[model samples]
Target: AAQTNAPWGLARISSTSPGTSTYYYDESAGQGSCVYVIDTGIEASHPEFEGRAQMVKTYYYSSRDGNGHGTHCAGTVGSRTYGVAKKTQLFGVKVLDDNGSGQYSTIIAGMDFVASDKNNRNCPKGVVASLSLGGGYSSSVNSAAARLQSSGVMVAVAAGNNNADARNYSPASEPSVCTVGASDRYDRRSSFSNYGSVLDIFGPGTDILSTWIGGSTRSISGTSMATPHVAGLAAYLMTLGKTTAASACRYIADTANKGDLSNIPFGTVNLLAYNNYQA
Candidate 1:
C-alpha cells in the first residue's frame, strides 16, 4: 500500500515553503514523469512498486536487483513510504555488479541505454537519472551524462560519502548533472558527505529507510541515499510544468529552503527542496 504520510526530508521541505501552513503534496504527484535508478538494478517484484517499476536492459549483468542498494535508492527516488514523488515511473538500469563493483565506463553504457532506448520511461515530459555511485573522474561517462541532459533529461549524481571535497570525484564534479550531498534528519549535512565547489545541492540521506531486496525495508546512509530524494523531486518538478532541464534546476534553486546548513568545504548550496507547484 502507498504511504499516507511523507518522509522526514520531504515533510520538512513541504512545510518549510513560504506561507505554507499544513504543507500539501501534488495530489497527482509525479504522474507525467519518469526516473531511472542506474545502479545495481532494482527489485521489480518489490510490493511497494505496485507495478510502477520494471527491470530493464543492463550493461554487464541482468537487470534484476541482486544487491539491495539500488532498490533502496529507487524507493527514495519514488516508492511509497520512502519515495519523494510516489507515483512516477521507475526504471532499473543496472550498471554495478551484485557486489556493488563496476567500472565508470559501465555506467556510460547505462546512460546510453537511457538516451536511445525510447521505452515507457522516456516520454514527452522527459526523464530523470538518479545515480548513487562514487568513482574517480571519467570523461567518457561525464560526456554521456552531458548528452542525456542535452536531450532534456535531468541527471542527479551523488557527491560520494567521503568527507573530502567532492570536486575530486567523477560525476559529482561533472557540471552537467545536479550533484547532491547527504544531510541528516535535523537538516544538517552528513559528516561523511563530500562537500565542495562542484556540488549543486544536498538532501536527507543518513540512516534513511527504504525498500530492500526480497520484500523488506532497511535504513542506510551515504550521499547515495541523499541523491534520490532530489531525483524524485526533479520528476515531481517536471510534472509541475518545469518542462525544460534548466527550468527545473532554476526552480529548485529559487525555492529551496536555503541556509549554510553544513560546514561545507566546497562550492555547495544549502537549498533544501519544496515542489508543490506547477510551472
Candidate 2:
C-alpha cells in the first residue's frame, strides 16, 4: 500500500521495484551493490536515502552539497523514492565547486578514489559509477574511467550538453565505459544533448525531478542529468548477474530500445536505455 515518488526515469526501466508498489524486483534493489556519485556532493541527511548514502571524499569543496547538483544526481542514483536502485549504498565524491565546475586533477582524483576503494569501499555486487559532470576532454579522467572499468566497476559518464560531437568529450570519449546522452520525457532527443558514435545510450534528462540539498525536491536537466539514470540502470543490472563492467556495458547496449531517435549516427549501436530488462 505504498507508492514511490520516483519520476518517469525510474518508471522507464522497471516499474516494480523500490520505486514501484509491486516490489517485483524488491530483493534485487541493489542490496549489496555500491555506487560512487562523482559529482558536486550529496546531502547524506536526506530522508529519501534513509541515511544509506555516505559522503566519502571531497576534492575542492566541503562534503556538503552546496550547489544541489550532486544531491540531485545522487538521488536519481539511489534515493528510496526518487532513485533507481533504492537499496544500493551511495557515496559522494565531490570534485566540482559551487559554480558546478572541477579541474582535471580533482576529477581524476575522484575516479582514482573509486577505482581503488572498491566503488572506492566499493562493492560486493559490483559498483555503479554515475558521473554527470563534463564539458571537455581530459586524458587523466578518461584513463581513470577506463582503469576503474577494468577493475570491475560499471562507469556511466555524460555525453555533454553542447549538442556537438561527443567524441570530443572526456569520459564519453573514454573507452570501457558507458557514455550517456540526454533524451526527453517522450523519448525524443533533447536539443542540448551531445551526439556522435561515442555515445553509448540515451537516458531521461529533461525536467528530471529528484532530491536536492536542504531536503528539498528539484528538477534539473543536462547530459549530466541523463548520466545518473544510466547509473541506476547499471546498479540494477548488477543485481541480475552482470558482474563485470565490460559485460554490464555490453548487456545494456544489447537490450536497449532502438526506437524514435531523432538523430542517429551511421554505426551508433546504442539504443535508448529503458527500465525494463531482457528477461
Candidate 3:
C-alpha cells in the first residue's frame, strides 16, 4: 500500500495543542443550536462529547466502522463532548462503507435525508450541514445542496486537501456552499491546502488535535480538520439567531489572526477582522 502524506503537515505551527476543542467554548459554548455532520458516525461516549451529542437521526449506508476516516472527521465536527460544536446536536450520515469510499448515490441519499428533515418537528430549527468530504463538483450534489440552502439549511464543505484549486469539486466548488481552506496555528495557509477564488474562508487544520478511534486522541492535518472549526463557529453564531453563512464567513475572515500573506500565494484572510465583527 502507498503511504499518503498527512494533510496540512506542510504548514508551520508552534506546537500541537493538548486537545482539539473549539475556542467558541471559551466564549459562548454553543448554548442553543445544532449542526449535522454528514460524515462517519461519532463516538457518542467520548468524554469530550458526553452530553453534547443529540443523535436525532442516523443513516448508515455502510456497515459499522466502514472506514475509520469518517469517525475521525466526525470527532472534529461534532463528537459528543469533545467536538468543536460540543453543545450542538449531531445528525450522523454514514455514506462511505468500511473501505472509506462510497458511491455518489449514497451521498445524494444522505443529502436527501437532511433536506427532508430540515423542518422536522422532532429536530431543532435552522439546522446546518457540515460536509468534510467531496467529489469533483457534481451538478446533482449542487442541486441538492442548493435546494437545502434555499430552504434555510446552511452548508459548509472542505476545500479538498489535494492542494489543488477548489474549483474542481462539486459541493465545495458550488457558490452556494461555504468553501473552507486550511491554515496553520500561526495563520498561514497550509502548503497542501487548495487555494483559489472559490476558497471562502480558512481555519486551523495543520496538526490539529482531536479525538480519534478507541477512546484516544491525536493531532491530524487536512482541510477536513480545518472545516469543523468553521462549522463549530457557525453553530455558535447561529445560537444568536439571524446569522447566515455569509455573515459567519465575514466574521471568521474578519477575526482570524492575520499576520503575513506573502508567505502564501493567496491574499490574507482577515481572521482578526472577524473577531472584531463578532464583538
Q: What is the C-alpha lDDT of each candidate?
A: 0.78, 0.79, 0.61
Candidate 2: list runs displaced more than 4 Å: 1-5, 15-27, 119-122, 265-267, 277-279
Model 2 poorest ten-residue lDDT run: 15-24
Instruction: Indicate the worst ten consecutive residues by lDDT in candidate 1.
Output: 15-24
Residues 177-262, candidate 3, lDDT per residue (tens digit)?
77788877555677778777777777667777666657677787888877776776676566655366446655555544454332
lDDT score for candidate 3 against the true structure: 0.61
lDDT tens readout by residue for model 2, 1-279: 123444766665553222332322444777778889998899999998998899988976378888999999999888987887888899998988877888888888888888887723746777878889875777777898888788778899999988788878998888678999887766678888888888888887888889998899988899888898889878877876754556876777777776646655566554777645433
What TM-score does structure 3 among the candidates reach?
Answer: 0.79
Q: Which ranking of candidates, highest TM-score first?
A: 1, 2, 3
Q: What is the lDDT of residue 48 in candidate 3?
A: 56
lDDT of each residue in 94-141, candidate 1, tens digit only:
999899988877888888888776454455555888989978777776
True-vs-predicted CA distance for residue 152, candidate 3, Å: 1.2
lDDT of 3 at 264: 48
**With candidate 1 superimposed using the best TM-score fit, by how many Å does residue 133's alpha carbon deviate from the native?**
1.0
What's each prediction's TM-score? 0.91, 0.90, 0.79
Candidate 3 runs further than 4 Å off: 1-27, 54-63, 79-82, 121-125, 245-247, 254-263, 266-279
